[PDB]
Amino acid sequence: KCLAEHHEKSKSTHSQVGDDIPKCNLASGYYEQMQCNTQQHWCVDPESGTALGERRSGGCTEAARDHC
DSSP states (O other): HHHHHHHHHHHHOOOOOOOOOOOOBTTTTTTEEEEESSSSSEESSSSSOBBBBBBOOSSTHHHHHOOO
């Protein structure tokens, strides 16, 4: 779903931005894996969809990888 819409929009026309969308790791294809944003950046679990780490640090991948 998230990939189908995100991809369909990214391909269709010149608009392929990813910020206010349901971040879903291609690993499983669910939006309950990771949740990165332009201003925020947090992670979740497929079990239910709850947070695992904190939400406050420089950059996204930086804190996401360093400690979610």
